[PDB]
Nucleic acid binder design. Structure first.
Ligand code: MG
Lengths: 662, 241, 453
RNA sequence: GCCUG
RNA sequence: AGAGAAAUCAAGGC
């Protein structure tokens, strides 16, 4: 460790990237997550009272306490209602332009949001098949369920989806009807409520910088529309709030604060830290109250407030998925038993136990309400005696104090801590460090020293081909290295070395390095290597990390006209069809690898055929979002008739073509 | 004759769609957006890990049932006719012995990339400097574009370029006239018949100017912002024209 | 009713686990109360980490580190070199550990013979039952069942605390020893601009600095072994596969580092563990450093070497990660490049042939060292950290970044203040259990002064 | 005893 | 046996 601490030439801050041991394997969680889930569920109850009384805390519906109950020497798991109201009012009065932008978003952008975007989410636990399915499959199943039960067609907008979700809750019973196999399943109102409010918990895999593994939670597709609406509103408000680091890149605001200075007379300080048990000490009621205050002060109608409050209320009555169970050992044997079968350290929760889920009111889970939690943390800063620059990203936070004296700086730091406790956020005493005078700190993996913010990535770029195809993989790898270079992480030497390593790995992956089938075949047929994946020398350079391989080779003369014609021939049989743009030309090397419950693969293939026929027959859906008044059949018939009747073929041929139409 | 054959194939596909997928064919047209992303494959999170095995499989590539590629070439088996399957040497073989397309198609496909290469090679570099330069990142245009077209009008411009007769007159008056004219001029030869999937992407990359956060020692133009990844790295500053 | 409506039944369902209606309207006057806070103490002196007490931590990595050696063979294919080694061999046991029985040597030779005929895949005969733990899970389960008595208790897991072994310093010393030939061979990129030329020159100078070190040789060996084992991970799935570690020297002579065998693995998940019988050439054997390896004496052309056998079980993810071990070269490179780029910025003139003096807290009377030596040592330490990366290392580094920042602040006479009841050293110490590299880093941290005036 | 990996 | 660390692999399902 003394080697990573220079006292000349460079400073220890520059060597911070040495402390990142990401080149080794990342830790992977093993087996059951029940212990972690139960600990996360029980922490809020233990921290609700100064004395860890769990039985008394478990009877609290909305977790709110007076300041006398707020723990100053430890974590707290509640909020003060009056403080939350006052802080929300102060936040609204401080960032009025952001509130006006939110009003515009609600009045214009919100009605136009299509529920199809829900297909872009993460894995979802389908309440119909009782299994984890991708977002598109769960969304399609939920939409079909709503259509079947409501006997109506769901509108394209997201508000229509939310209205359908609300309407289906009224029905006493619901029914869903779906190799060939027909099955009908009937749910009661209580069963559907449990499915809607139930969360799916899973291990957080390949997470670095943590000794102990932790879990994440995701909601069901029924409540994903409201969550999406609330999160979009949170993002819209946060994008115009100076105190935030999620949507603005984070580095820009930290650099702006670093550039700021003073008159070399005022006392400066820099407090960088995290929040301990951030997700296990927040109450959804606080967030919903803050959102209600925001909307009410905005003049919004009642239905908007109800829509914004529904997801938080559903989250309050959450049924967290325990998982496989707790581990017990009768000597050398091992068994997994659910909570309540045998005594354990979490016996206090046996009362709130369902078939396999545990009902939890207090606290939250990581990975579900991030922007709302950030807003809750930010409203705290809006005090009358917190004149400083605060930047917070979910959990990490950095605060620059510029006061008149050291005692004032300490008072302001304590006020910040106590206000965060007021809202229900406890800054970790061990992980929070205040340095005076300001000029050194860390935030979101970016290290600020005097007047330079160096960005250090949590992981080095994967200098390996993605696995799609030679051209696409090469373009993506070069783009990734370029993004790392221009983000301040990699310099000329590091960038060039990373490119060299990536080139070696990319050549190896495609059997173009030693004596392989590809190289042997090319040599036996006098096929001169012309491309990088063919064994040719790397034509790319550090300056030319953005140019296409084919275009650069053509310009340099490494490829002749005949080879280009043969390669880019669109009739060749080996090509078909956020910050990961792919600008590779569609050459013959842009192929696809053949990658190789039975009642769902057939549906997927059928949908693939339908979308292919639409794409070839509708040369308009690849440019704009699909939209047409009517169903697929009507629009397809109209388009086909217009196309056929507009051709120059004779009447007899047109009639022959039309007659074959089914 | 080609139009009639294509229409007959489309009619056969319509028969297949209406006969095999009667339930799906009755859903809302907007429902397309939902099931265009339909996929049972999970988020692998590590396709690069399986790439090595996939490339070394006996028949990794999936090719259309074409006849130009011989079944056996110099003893090597190029394709497995039961989309058929073929080995990784097929693209290499096609690069030497294969059907040749018109030079116009090659120029059209490479228009964006060729323009980028020419832009890189059509400028000179000044004396590279070294010093304590602060590269304050700013949001600037990524790549120089054909013409200044607002993001809202980009889809309308693409529609006018490709299928102008399928859009409303009001939409027809929402797209840049110069951009649409020149894009149709340069994308006409064969890019605008069947290979629309890549033609639309090329057109968008030509007209769509995406803004990105890039390091800027000095104010960056789109031409410079294209190559800003090596003009400054907090320790040097190369001056262009 | 306007655009979105909530029915009465759904309203009642929503108002089930909360104290307010669908629209919360609490009747409390909004104000922020005053809470009695605590005092913000000052970290006058940097903390000291907890040095654990226990048996010295053995070498638990996959392959050998600094002790790795190779046998020189005449130029040829891998099959030719393997046949040459096998034909002239007098392997005899020297130190048999109960973890790796000496009988398992029969598996290695049978593989080498199988590799001399041109077929790396070999069928199990007798010794693969214990070599790769075939049907061992069933045996353990049956043994536990036959010895079952008592009452179920919440499963308690304990991590045996261990002290800093004395071989970490030896490995660090031996890893930076200079070699004869360059062990880093990467095809250079094309040059089209002065910037490209400067970048290529910097990369070439870095490779020259760190190319002829023992750490580079070990990195190349690890990369080759991991790549060859990962590639041949689904070749047969039911027979022993041979993945010899062979490199080519500039003269063309083969260099046999060792031999990795893959057992009849039954792998389903990406995190599953497949068995291995890594056989590698040592340079010096220490009983307390390799308690689980079994060491034999191998005689080739009169010369004598030590061959160590280990019965390991490694995951697909780890094999894939160590296949791309060359990335360990990226971290030191930047530190070198920056230093060079720091000297060019102060005079507006690049100088590739520059190695200034880096001052460090070194145990001896030496005030510091040179840039080249420091970069070589950084590469060695980073390689060791990457090899020994586990949750302990992750947490230790994550919580030691804070203390590194605090030390840097102290170096500039910046006062570091702390909240009430704060103990960052408490966060760091929980990550110090077994990892020998973490213990080495903790010892290095304790070596440096904790008070700055 | 049959089968995926 | 071994890998490993707060619970898993050292083959699973029918
Ligand atoms: Mg932080």
């Amino acid at each position: 460790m003394n080697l990573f601490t220079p006292r000349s030439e460079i400073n220890p801050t520059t060597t911070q990237e040495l402390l990142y041991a990401y080149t080794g394997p990342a830790p992977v969680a093993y087996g059951t997550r029940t212990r972690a889930v139960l600990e996360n569920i029980i922490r809020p109850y233990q921290y609700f009272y100064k004395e860890p009384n769990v039985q008394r805390a478990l009877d609290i519906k909305t977790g709110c306490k007076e300041p006398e109950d707020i723990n100053v020497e430890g974590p707290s798991s509640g909020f003060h209602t009056a403080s939350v109201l006052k802080l929300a009012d102060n936040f609204f009065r401080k960032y009025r332009p952001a509130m006006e932008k939110l009003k515009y978003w609600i009045l214009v952008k919100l009605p136009k949001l299509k529920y199809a975007e829900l297909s872009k989410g993460r894995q979802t636990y389908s309440f119909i098949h009782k299994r984890n399915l991708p977002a598109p499959i769960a969304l399609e199943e939920t939409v079909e369920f709503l259509e079947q039960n409501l006997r109506r067609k769901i509108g394209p907008t997201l508000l229509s989806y939310c209205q359908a979700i609300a309407d289906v809750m009224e029905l006493d019973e619901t029914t869903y009807e779906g190799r060939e196999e027909t099955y009908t399943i009937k749910f009661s109102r209580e069963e559907l409520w449990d499915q809607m409010r139930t969360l799916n918990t899973m291990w957080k895999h390949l997470e670095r910088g943590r000794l102990n593994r932790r879990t994440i939670a995701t909601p069901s597709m029924l409540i994903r529309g409201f969550v999406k609406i609330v999160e979009d509103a949170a993002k819209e408000i946060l994008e115009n709030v100076p105190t935030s680091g999620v949507p603005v890149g984070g580095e820009e605001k930290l650099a702006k604060l670093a550039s700021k200075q003073t008159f070399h007379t005022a006392v400066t300080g820099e407090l960088s830290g995290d929040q301990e048990k951030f997700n296990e000490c927040l109450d959804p009621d606080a967030m919903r109250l803050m959102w209600t205050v925001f909307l009410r002060k905005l003049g919004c109608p009642d239905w908007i407030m109800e829509l914004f409050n529904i997801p938080f209320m559903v989250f309050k009555s959450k049924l967290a998925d325990m998982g496989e169970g707790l581990v017990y050992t009768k000597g050398k044997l091992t068994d997994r038993k659910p909570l309540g079968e045998m005594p354990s350290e979490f016996d206090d929760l046996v009362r709130n136990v369902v078939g396999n889920s545990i009902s939890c009111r207090l606290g939250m889970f990581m990975g579900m309400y991030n922007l709302t939690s950030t807003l809750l943390a930010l409203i705290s800063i809006e005090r009358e005696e917190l004149t400083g620059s605060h930047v917070e990203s979910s959990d990490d936070f950095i605060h620059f104090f510029n006061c008149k004296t050291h005692e004032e700086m300490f008072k302001q730091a304590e006020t910040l801590r106590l206000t965060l406790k007021l809202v229900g956020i406890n800054m970790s005493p061990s992980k929070c460090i205040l340095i005076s005078p300001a000029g050194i700190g860390e935030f979101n993996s970016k290290f600020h020293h005097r007047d330079f913010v160096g960005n250090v990535a949590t992981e080095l770029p994967a200098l390996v081909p993605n696995g799609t195809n030679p051209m696409t993989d090469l373009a993506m790898g070069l783009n990734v290295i370029k993004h790392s270079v221009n983000t301040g992480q990699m310099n000329l030497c590091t960038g060039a070395l990373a490119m060299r390593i990536f080139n070696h790995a990319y050549k190896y992956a495609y059997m173009a390095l030693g004596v392989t089938r590809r190289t042997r075949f090319m040599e036996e047929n006098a096929i001169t290597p012309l491309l990088t994946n063919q064994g040719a020398s790397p034509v790319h350079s550090f300056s030319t990390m953005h140019l296409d391989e084919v275009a650069l080779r053509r310009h340099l003369g490494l490829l002749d006209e005949e080879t280009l014609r043969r390669i880019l021939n669109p009739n060749n049989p080996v090509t078909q069809k956020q910050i990961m743009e792919d600008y590779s030309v569609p050459s013959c090397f842009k192929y696809t690898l053949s990658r190789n419950h039975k009642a769902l693969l057939n549906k997927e293939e059928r949908y693939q055929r339908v979308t292919s026929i639409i794409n070839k027959l509708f040369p308009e859906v690849l440019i704009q979002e699909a939209s047409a008044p009517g169903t697929v059949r009507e629009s397809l018939k109209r388009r086909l008739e217009l196309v056929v009747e507009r051709s120059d073929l004779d009447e007899e041929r047109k009639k022959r073509i039309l007659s074959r139409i089914f | 004759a080609e139009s009639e054959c294509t229409l007959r194939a489309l009619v056969e596909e319509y028969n297949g769609a209406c006969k095999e997928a009667p339930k799906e064919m009755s859903k809302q047209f907007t429902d397309y957006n939902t099931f265009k992303r339909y996929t049972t494959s999970k988020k692998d999170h590590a396709p690069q890990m399986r790439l090595v095995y996939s490339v070394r499989k006996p028949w990794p590539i999936s090719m259309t049932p074409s006849k130009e590629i011989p079944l056996v070439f110099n003893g090597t088996k190029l394709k497995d006719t039961i989309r058929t399957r073929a080995n990784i040497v097929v693209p290499d073989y096609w690069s030497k012995y294969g059907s040749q397309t018109s030079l116009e198609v090659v120029n059209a496909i490479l228009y964006a990339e060729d323009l980028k290469v020419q832009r890189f090679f059509s400028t000179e570099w000044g004396e590279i400097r070294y010093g304590r330069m602060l590269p304050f990142r700013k949001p600037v245009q990524a790549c120089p574009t054909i013409e200044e077209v607002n993001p809202a009008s980009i889809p309308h411009t693409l529609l006018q370029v490709f299928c102008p007769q399928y859009t409303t007159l009001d939409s027809k008056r929402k797209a840049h006239m110069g951009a649409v004219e020149k894009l149709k001029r340069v994308m006409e030869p064969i890019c605008k018949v069947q290979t629309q999937e890549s033609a639309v992407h090329i057109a968008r990359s030509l007209i769509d100017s995406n803004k990105k956060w890039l390091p800027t020692v000095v104010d960056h133009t789109p031409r410079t912002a294209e190559m800003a990844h090596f003009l400054c790295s907090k320790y040097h500053y190369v001056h262009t024209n | 009713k306007l655009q979105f409506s909530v029915g009465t039944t759904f309203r009642t369902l929503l108002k089930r686990d909360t104290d307010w209606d669908v629209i919360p309207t609490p009747r409390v006057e909004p104000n922020v109360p005053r809470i009695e806070g605590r005092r913000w103490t000052q970290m006058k002196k940097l903390p000291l980490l907890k040095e654990k007490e226990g048996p010295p931590s053995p070498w638990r990595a996959l392959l050998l580190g600094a002790d790795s050696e190779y046998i020189v063979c005449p130029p040829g294919t891998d099959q030719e070199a393997i046949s040459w080694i096998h034909s002239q061999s007098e392997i005899e046991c020297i130190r048999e550990s109960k973890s790796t029985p000496a009988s398992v040597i029969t598996c290695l030779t049978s593989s080498l013979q199988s590799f001399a005929e041109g077929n790396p895949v070999r069928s199990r005969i007798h010794e693969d039952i214990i070599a790769f733990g075939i049907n061992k899970k069933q045996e353990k389960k049956q043994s536990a069942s036959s010895s079952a008595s008592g009452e179920w208790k919440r499963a308690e897991y304990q991590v045996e605390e261990m002290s800093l072994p004395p071989w970490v310093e030896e490995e660090m010393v031996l890893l930076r020893s200079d070699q004869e030939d360059n062990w880093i061979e990467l095809e250079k990129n094309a040059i089209y601009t002065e910037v490209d030329g400067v970048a290529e020159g910097l990369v070439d100078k870095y490779i020259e600095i760190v190319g002829r070190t023992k750490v580079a040789s070990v990195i190349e060996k690890w990369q080759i072994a991991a790549t060859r084992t990962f590639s041949q991970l689904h070749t047969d799935r039911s027979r022993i596969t041979a993945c010899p570690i062979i490199t080519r020297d500039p003269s063309g002579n083969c260099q046999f580092w060792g031999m990795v065998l893959l057992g009849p693995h039954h792998v389903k998940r990406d995190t599953d563990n497949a068995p291995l019988l890594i056989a590698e050439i040592m340079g010096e054997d220490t009983e307390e450093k390799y308690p689980k390896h079994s060491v034999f004496s191998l005689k080739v052309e009169g010369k004598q070497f030590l061959l160590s056998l280990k019965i390991t079980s490694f995951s697909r993810n780890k094999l894939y990660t160590f296949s791309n071990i060359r990335r360990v070269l990226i971290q030191p490179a930047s530190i070198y490049s920056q230093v060079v780029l720091s000297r060019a910025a102060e005079n507006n003139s690049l100088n590739l042939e520059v190695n200034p003096e880096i001052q460090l807290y070194l145990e001896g009377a030496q005030r510091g060292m040179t840039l080249y030596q420091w970069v070589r040592m950084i590469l060695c330490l980073e390689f060791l950290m990457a090899i020994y990366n586990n949750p302990q290392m992750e947490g230790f580094l994550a919580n030691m970044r804070r203390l590194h920042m605090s030390r840097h602040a102290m170096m500039e006479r910046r006062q570091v203040f702390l909240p009430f009841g704060s103990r960052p050293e408490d966060k760091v110490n929980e990550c110090i259990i077994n990892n020998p590299i973490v213990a080495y880093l903790a010892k290095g941290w304790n070596s440096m002064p904790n008070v700055y005036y």
